[PDB]
Amino acid sequence: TLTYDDIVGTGLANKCPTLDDTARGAYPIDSSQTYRIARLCLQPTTFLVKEEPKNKRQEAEFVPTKLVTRETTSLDQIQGELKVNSDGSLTFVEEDGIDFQPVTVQMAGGERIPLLFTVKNLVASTQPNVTSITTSTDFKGEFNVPSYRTANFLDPKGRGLASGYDSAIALPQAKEEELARANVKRFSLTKGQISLNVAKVDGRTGEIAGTFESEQLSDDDMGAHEPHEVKIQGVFYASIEPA
Amino acid sequence: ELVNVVDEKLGTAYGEKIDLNNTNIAAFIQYRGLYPTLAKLIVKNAPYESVEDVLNIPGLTERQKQILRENLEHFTVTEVETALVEGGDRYNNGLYK
Amino acid sequence: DQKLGANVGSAQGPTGLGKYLMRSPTGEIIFGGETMRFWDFRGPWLEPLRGPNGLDLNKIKNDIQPWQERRAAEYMTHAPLGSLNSVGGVATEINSVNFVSP
Amino acid sequence: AELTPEVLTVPLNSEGKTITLTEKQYLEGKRLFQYACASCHVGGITKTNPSLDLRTETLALATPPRDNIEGLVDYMKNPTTYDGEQEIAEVHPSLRSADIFPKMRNLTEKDLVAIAGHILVEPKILGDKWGGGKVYY
Amino acid sequence: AIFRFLLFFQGFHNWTLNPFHMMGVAGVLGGALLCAIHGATVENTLFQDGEGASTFRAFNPTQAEETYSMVTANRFWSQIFGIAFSNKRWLHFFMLFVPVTGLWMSAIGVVGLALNLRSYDFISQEIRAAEDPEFETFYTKNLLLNEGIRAWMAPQDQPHENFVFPEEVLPRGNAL
Amino acid sequence: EKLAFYDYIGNNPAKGGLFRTGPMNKGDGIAQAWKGHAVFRNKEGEELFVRRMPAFFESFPVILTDKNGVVKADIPFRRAESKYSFEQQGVTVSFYGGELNGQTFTDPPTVKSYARKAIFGEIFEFDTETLNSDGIFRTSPRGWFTFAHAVFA
Amino acid sequence: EKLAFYDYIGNNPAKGGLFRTGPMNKGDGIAQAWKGHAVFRNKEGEELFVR
Amino acid sequence: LNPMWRQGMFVLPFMARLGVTGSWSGWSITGETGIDPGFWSFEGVALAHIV
Amino acid sequence: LNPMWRQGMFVLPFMARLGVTGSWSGWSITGETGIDPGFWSFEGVALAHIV
Amino acid sequence: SANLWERFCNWVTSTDNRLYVGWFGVIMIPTLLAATICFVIAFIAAPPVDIDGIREPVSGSLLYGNNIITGAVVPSSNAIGLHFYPIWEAASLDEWLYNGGPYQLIIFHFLLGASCYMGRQWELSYRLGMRPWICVAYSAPLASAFAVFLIYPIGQGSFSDGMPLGISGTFNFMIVFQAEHNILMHPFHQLGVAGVFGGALFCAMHGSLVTSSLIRETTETESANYGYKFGQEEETYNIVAAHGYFGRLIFQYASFNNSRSLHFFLAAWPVVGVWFTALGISTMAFNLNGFNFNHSVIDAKGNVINTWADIINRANLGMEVMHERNAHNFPLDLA
Ligand code: CLA
Ligand code: CLA
Numbered sequence A: 001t002l003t004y005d006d007i008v009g010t011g012l013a014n015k016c017p018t019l020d021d022t023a024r025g026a027y028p029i030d031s032s033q034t035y036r037i038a039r040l041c042l043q044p045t046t047f048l049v050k051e052e053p054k055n056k057r058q059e060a061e062f063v064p065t066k067l068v069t070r071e072t073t074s075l076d077q078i079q080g081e082l083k084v085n086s087d088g089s090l091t092f093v094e095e096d097g098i099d100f101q102p103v104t105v106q107m108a109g110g111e112r113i114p115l116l117f118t119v120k121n122l123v124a125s126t127q128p129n130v131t132s133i134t135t136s137t138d139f140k141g142e143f144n145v146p147s148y149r150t151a152n153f154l155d156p157k158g159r160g161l162a163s164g165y166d167s168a169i170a171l172p173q174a175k176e177e178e179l180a181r182a183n184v185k186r187f188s189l190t191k192g193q194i195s196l197n198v199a200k201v202d203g204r205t206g207e208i209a210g211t212f213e214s215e216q217l218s219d220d221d222m223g224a225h226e227p228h229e230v231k232i233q234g235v236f237y238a239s240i241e242p243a
Numbered sequence B: 001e002l003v004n005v006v007d008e009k010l011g012t013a014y015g016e017k018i019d020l021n022n023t024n025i026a027a028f029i030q031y032r033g034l035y036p037t038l039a040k041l042i043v044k045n046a047p048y049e050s051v052e053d054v055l056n057i058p059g060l061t062e063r064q065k066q067i068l069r070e071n072l073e074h075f076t077v078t079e080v081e082t083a084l085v086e087g088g089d090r091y092n093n094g095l096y097k
Numbered sequence C: 001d002q003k004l005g006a007n008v009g010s011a012q013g014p015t016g017l018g019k020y021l022m023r024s025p026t027g028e029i030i031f032g033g034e035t036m037r038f039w040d041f042r043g044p045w046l047e048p049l050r051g052p053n054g055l056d057l058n059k060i061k062n063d064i065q066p067w068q069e070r071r072a073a074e075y076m077t078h079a080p081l082g083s084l085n086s087v088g089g090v091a092t093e094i095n096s097v098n099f100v101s102p
Numbered sequence D: 001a002e003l004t005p006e007v008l009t010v011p012l013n014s015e016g017k018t019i020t021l022t023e024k025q026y027l028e029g030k031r032l033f034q035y036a037c038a039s040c041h042v043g044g045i046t047k048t049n050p051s052l053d054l055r056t057e058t059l060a061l062a063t064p065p066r067d068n069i070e071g072l073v074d075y076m077k078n079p080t081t082y083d084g085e086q087e088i089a090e091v092h093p094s095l096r097s098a099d100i101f102p103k104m105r106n107l108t109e110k111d112l113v114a115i116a117g118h119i120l121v122e123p124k125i126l127g128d129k130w131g132g133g134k135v136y137y
Numbered sequence E: 001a002i003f004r005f006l007l008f009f010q011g012f013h014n015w016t017l018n019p020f021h022m023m024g025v026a027g028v029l030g031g032a033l034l035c036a037i038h039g040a041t042v043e044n045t046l047f048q049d050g051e052g053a054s055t056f057r058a059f060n061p062t063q064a065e066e067t068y069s070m071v072t073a074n075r076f077w078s079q080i081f082g083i084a085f086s087n088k089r090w091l092h093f094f095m096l097f098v099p100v101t102g103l104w105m106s107a108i109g110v111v112g113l114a115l116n117l118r119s120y121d122f123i124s125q126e127i128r129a130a131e132d133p134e135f136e137t138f139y140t141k142n143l144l145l146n147e148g149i150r151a152w153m154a155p156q157d158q159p160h161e162n163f164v165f166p167e168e169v170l171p172r173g174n175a176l
Numbered sequence F: 001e002k003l004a005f006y007d008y009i010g011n012n013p014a015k016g017g018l019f020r021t022g023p024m025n026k027g028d029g030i031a032q033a034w035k036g037h038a039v040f041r042n043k044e045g046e047e048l049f050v051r052r053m054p055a056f057f058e059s060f061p062v063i064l065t066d067k068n069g070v071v072k073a074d075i076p077f078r079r080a081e082s083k084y085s086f087e088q089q090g091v092t093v094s095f096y097g098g099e100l101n102g103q104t105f106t107d108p109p110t111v112k113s114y115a116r117k118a119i120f121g122e123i124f125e126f127d128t129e130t131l132n133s134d135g136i137f138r139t140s141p142r143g144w145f146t147f148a149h150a151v152f153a
Numbered sequence G: 001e002k003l004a005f006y007d008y009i010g011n012n013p014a015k016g017g018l019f020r021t022g023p024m025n026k027g028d029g030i031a032q033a034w035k036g037h038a039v040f041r042n043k044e045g046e047e048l049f050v051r
Numbered sequence H, I: 001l002n003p004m005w006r007q008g009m010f011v012l013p014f015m016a017r018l019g020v021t022g023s024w025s026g027w028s029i030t031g032e033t034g035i036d037p038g039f040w041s042f043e044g045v046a047l048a049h050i051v
Numbered sequence J: 001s002a003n004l005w006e007r008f009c010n011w012v013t014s015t016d017n018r019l020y021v022g023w024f025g026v027i028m029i030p031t032l033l034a035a036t037i038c039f040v041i042a043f044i045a046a047p048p049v050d051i052d053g054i055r056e057p058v059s060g061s062l063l064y065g066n067n068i069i070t071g072a073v074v075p076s077s078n079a080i081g082l083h084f085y086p087i088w089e090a091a092s093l094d095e096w097l098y099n100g101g102p103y104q105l106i107i108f109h110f111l112l113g114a115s116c117y118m119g120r121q122w123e124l125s126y127r128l129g130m131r132p133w134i135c136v137a138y139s140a141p142l143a144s145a146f147a148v149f150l151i152y153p154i155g156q157g158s159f160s161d162g163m164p165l166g167i168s169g170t171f172n173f174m175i176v177f178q179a180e181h182n183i184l185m186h187p188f189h190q191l192g193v194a195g196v197f198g199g200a201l202f203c204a205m206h207g208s209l210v211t212s213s214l215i216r217e218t219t220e221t222e223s224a225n226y227g228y229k230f231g232q233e234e235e236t237y238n239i240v241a242a243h244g245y246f247g248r249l250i251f252q253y254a255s256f257n258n259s260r261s262l263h264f265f266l267a268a269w270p271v272v273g274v275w276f277t278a279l280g281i282s283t284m285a286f287n288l289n290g291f292n293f294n295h296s297v298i299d300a301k302g303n304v305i306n307t308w309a310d311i312i313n314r315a316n317l318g319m320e321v322m323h324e325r326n327a328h329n330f331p332l333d334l335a
């Protein structure tokens, strides 16, 4: 174990815990004993942004991006119950935790793509009949992606949703129909997809690890422009305990 | 068409009475004995399909249910508005003195 | 706010950054707001809440001690802000509290 | 335009009975208010909890009623939450916690009454200012 | 009462953004530089006309030779700054020109403020800021400061208007 | 119409800017018609009045008061605790004489729109297309003559 | 698409004018997409060709 | 609704203040028609000064 | 559909003909991403000449 | 070769150079060149910077929609605070430009160079056999750059609160400063304008008096400046005639007759005045602000009788209340 001072500034704090190459066993499920996740953690490795195919529909792919912010990406301290289902499957239901981190990435052009990387209200599920959690025991489910900026946020000219100006006060006698979209703030709310695939188990201490892949939309800036589709790949760590 | 959900909400029951599904917690201070204990329970306990559903909060003492019945006339209920509920704004919407 | 039933860990501020808790540039869990610049602060009252990765959400959730709350309140209300004529507070404050931090 | 004893007449208890303070008490209260309150309650607000002010109306809708000498005085000894369903003397200055809040050790019952009187007299003088914050400065 | 006159012109006229004012400060600030630099230059290029350290007594009130080395002063600034005077007659006229010209430019700006013909905004900037909610400059920031100044000051600064601004109509940021 | 046109702040020489070049029409646009006098009322039927803009102010808030000057309605900045929002007060607007003569509007956006306009005095219909106006007030020849001759002098 | 784009007279350098300044996009505009090959036919079904 | 002082006219008003209120093309400042300004029209005035 | 020669680029192609086909900002003439042009990007070349 | 290093030292120290590269110059010249080059490139082409660390990038460069007046180099992020942020501390330059990397590189290099520039103003004076202290006069404008670029950020705990490198950006720094500190009501500031006003005043005073009492050596249709030759023995103006006039404007003993006492005063006043104004910013860097006379004078009942100080406070609140919109989450601005 390492103290706080043994981590500070090293960037290690933005790293989900890891298992050794040994720990590749299996953790058993009583199915008559409630289980929960004491700590889920998600660490991003890559941020992919699906590019707009221009007018020419030609099918679009995801493109790598540079992380313009710094090591503030990781999600940690996630918790909730891991209820066992009738069909012998497992479904995780998140309760609370650092379930979101605002990330901003750049592209080829130089365009900054801000997103709210999150897993709020996660409901991941596994395969039916899973007496023991083995290596690669896929977790899949949805989560909620709330607006990047919240109600109180004001744009550089003072306009906002829950507060702020009603219009473009700098152009007192201008036609307003054109400015409509920029004056009227909208609060976006959408769904997301994620799949946590195990790679390392440890039946002894009951802690699994592996990699994840999630998809969601980026910031629409209070509904001023269209959001970008984002793909996020990384690693995760879960601490399973009876409780 | 584009509309400001918060300003539109002010044309409903919200903006006239304490909305049990949206209105921020600090609003319960304007009525006797509602704020600390009870308002927490109200807000924490999900939305409600009707004003009366607040009396069904599990754990409520006989006195708490009495107080609630008294202030029911000051309550209403509308669709949960994300703009007003997201970000924990019901516990702190960034407003102070 | 936590006593009012707010989940500080997942609370989203106006900028979408973290009303109460956020991350330092190297990943450590720190206090949110303009106070992000003072994430280098260490102090007896605050340390028992700190973990190996910074502020622990579990200790924050149920290990907060009363002496810490009123300590925070004390130091909060005695910031080194004042006027030449010794009027504690921001330049826009009203006369009442005669104080300027030593 | 002066501090008449007409202004210094504030409600003593819940049963309508009133008390008339003196210019000595007021000043004394005002001084003691700076000594032990101003720190968090400057100009009738509450820095560490802006949701609750020292407005007489706010004190009236308190539980128990704290919009009188008696209400306030009890509070300064055994402070509670706005609904009164919880004692907060551990994180709030009071007589039963003078070991924790040294400023309250000196304070004697006269001092308590003076302070209480001050809280009830200020809004009579300042008005909206006493309650509101920077808006009314 | 003069300080508010400053804050007023900022809030209402955006006086700092006025080209005529900028020339103003340039003259005053530049004039206060000439004052400093020339005085210091002279005192530290002086000839020795006495045997004491306090060289003040060692000055001849009845003209004759130059009390300080103009030639040395020249080569100095020519090597540290690259440019240097070499005509006391021009140097001193320059000391007249700079602060007098500045004050005059600042005057013209004020004459325009009388008709409220201010240098408040940049149209190209506002048009983009309206269409684009992510466009932000230090210019845009300042105007928001002005809005706050106008709203919060006007009531007690212009009593004759009987202003009444509800708390809810007062422009405010978050928390503050 | 002419008489009404004078009661519009967009013809006030004290409005404008030093580098806001061109005619006044590059500002609010070429005036086409008088939309008409706007009368504001609330649910109780009480007639409200829009507080006009002082020349000093580049921007001014929308506030409605009755005859006695009591604030009855407004357009809030922070909605969180608004007491006088047009929605809460059921503010409506009616027009008499002119383009909008005899018509009434009750939908909050539209009502707030004209209320936002009444700040400037009598509401008019402008042609912004032609000269490609920017919606920013410019001073009259009266303003410019005064400025030049005051400086020159 | 790229191959089809070369078979468009708006990329022929022999088109244009001496004082027709700017890029080729100031002319026909920024190419967004290939509308596709147009096949012309008449009532009898005969396929026609544009000169 | 669209008088001279709305169209940024600076010299035009000074010509109208002292009599000249018509044009050779037929129109007039007051807004009348069929009027005959004679030679001393806005055009006339402009002409003279040039000479 | 929108290459350099449509955007009135005159100097850019001569830099691409001899190797420099990338920018410090990440993009590239061929249309690839993640590439590392090193120092000798369009910016670099421009930089050099100015010096 | 008499000895390479010995020659090198003789060249550096050489007073026969067009520009005196001193020993301080060995540090100055490179540092000033990095500062300027980085500045010029940034001001023109740098991308928007998240100054307040709230993921709200502020564009301040020409190519990104600014002009000279609005354009600026944006201070480093508030997420960085007082941390050292060189290029080699960023995963990429894209990241470095986003967190306001250039700003530190500039201010540090400038302040370093501008200090050596003061050091050189001594050296050359030493090499030429003239008295020092010219550099002491330059310590006042330098101490201001230090206060505005370094001392205040240190005090406030972040370089993001340092004065931006731009026109309008400079205006923001002032307006906000006034709000948080009430600088107009601070003695040290008032001494500053006194020095600056008096400076411009005395600059015009001395300038005019001298140029007005010039000995005639020029034609009626010939520039009066030609009546002076570079490297004169005697004076070009009648200082006794100058004193005679100014001595009658006010009264004799309130007039200078000693050129040396004159030029000392000409130098002392603004330098001293600016010194205090620099100390003002450095003092209010630790939140020892100007006089707070809010709600001071009250009537016999207790009603608050307003003064101009209160009218100032209203203006200040508005600045306070509106600045850094989305940066605050809590009631008190202790940052
Ligand atoms: C870098 C900072 C800076 C600087 C150097 C300046 C510089 C200037 N400003 Mg300024 N300003 C600034 C920032 C700055 N500004 C900011 C940030 C604001 C806020 C928006 C303003 C707002 C502002 C306003 C509102 C005005 C100025 C004006 C001026 C100019 C005139 C000052 C002067 O000489 O008064 C001297 C004034 C006189 C009237 C001189 C006559 C005085 C008599 C002769 C003295 C008699 C004394 C008597 C004998 C003694 C008895 C007194 C007794 C107490 C003993 C000057 C060019 C003024 C201007 O442009 O005027 C044209 C003006 O009105 N400024
Ligand atoms: C002083 C007399 C005067 C006045 C009051 C006007 C008034 C007007 N003119 Mg006009 N004009 C004049 C003389 C005048 N004119 C002259 C002499 C010419 C011939 C060149 C013109 C040519 C002209 C044209 C071609 C047009 C107008 C238009 C207009 C109208 C729009 C106003 C405008 O754009 O202002 C703009 C004012 C400014 C931009 C102010 C400039 C101030 C400068 C920048 C200050 C310079 C400071 C200096 C450099 C500092 C250095 C000193 C330092 C070294 C000490 C307005 C009615 C327009 C019109 O008809 O409207 C429909 C129009 O299109 N004018």
Ligand code: CLA
Residues within 6 Å of the ligand: G018, G019, G020, G021, G022, G023, I007, I008, I009, I010
């Ligand atoms: C000869 C070399 C050359 C060539 C082939 C090009 C080619 C191009 N340039 Mg370019 N350019 C060049 C040199 C060159 N440039 C130089 C040296 C500069 C610096 C000033 C520029 C600055 C520049 C800019 C700023 C822009 C271009 C653009 C363009 C593109 C548009 C073409 C255009 O507008 O043509 C227009 C051609 C003409 C109008 C022909 C003018 C011929 C004159 C009028 C003849 C003069 C006759 C003379 C007066 C007779 C007197 C003699 C008599 C007394 C005997 C094109 C790819 C544009 C671009 O990037 O596209 C998107 C653009 O915006 N150029």
Ligand SMILES: C=Cc1c(C)c2cc3nc(c4c5[nH]c(cc6nc(cc1[nH]2)C(C)=C6CC)c(C)c5C(=O)[C@@H]4C(=O)OC)[C@@H](CCC(=O)OC/C=C(\C)CCC[C@H](C)CCC[C@H](C)CCCC(C)C)[C@@H]3C
Residues within 6 Å of the ligand: E002, E028, E099, E100, E103, J197, J198, J200, J201, J202, J204, J205, J208, J249
């Ligand atoms: C605010 C700054 C400032 C002040 C206070 C100031 C003051 C003075 N400058 C004078 C001179 C000058 N000033 C000059 C250039 C400059 N002066 C500048 C800035 C200033 N100069 C600047 C920036 C320049 C460069 C352009 C020159 C070139 C001269 C002189 O020749 C002259 C002098 O002799 O220098 C020593 C003196 C004129 C005496 C006089 O007329 O009394 C007689 C008239 C009186 C007493 C009536 C004045 C009444 C005034 C208009 C109203 C004041 C109202 C209250 C009484 C004052 C208090 C109000 C304040 C609190 C705001 C006086 C001491």
Ligand SMILES: CCCCCCCCCCCCCCCC(=O)OC[C@H](CO[C@H]1O[C@H](CS(=O)(=O)O)[C@@H](O)[C@H](O)[C@H]1O)OC(=O)CCCCCCCCCCCCCCC
Residues within 6 Å of the ligand: J011, J017, J018, J019, J020, J021, J028, J029, J032, J033, J036
């Ligand atoms: C990372 C490390 C980088 C290393 C850089 C590579 C080495 C430096 C190469 C320099 C090449 C450029 C030569 C410049 C010539 C010149 O300056 O004058 C030429 C003169 C002539 O002397 C000189 O010239 C004489 C030869 S000759 O006369 O020029 O032929 C010579 O004999 C004598 O020794 C010499 O003094 O040189 C000098 O007077 C010495 C001072 C030079 C000052 C340097 C610039 C100062 C900048 C200050 C900061 C400014 C901030 C930004 C300003 C916008």
Ligand SMILES: [Ca+2]
Residues within 6 Å of the ligand: A052, A111
């Ligand atoms: Ca895109």
Ligand SMILES: [Cl-]
Residues within 6 Å of the ligand: E141, E142, J172, J176, J323, J324
């Ligand atoms: Cl700001």
Ligand SMILES: [Fe+2]
Residues within 6 Å of the ligand: E038, E042, J206, J210, J263
């Ligand atoms: Fe001199």
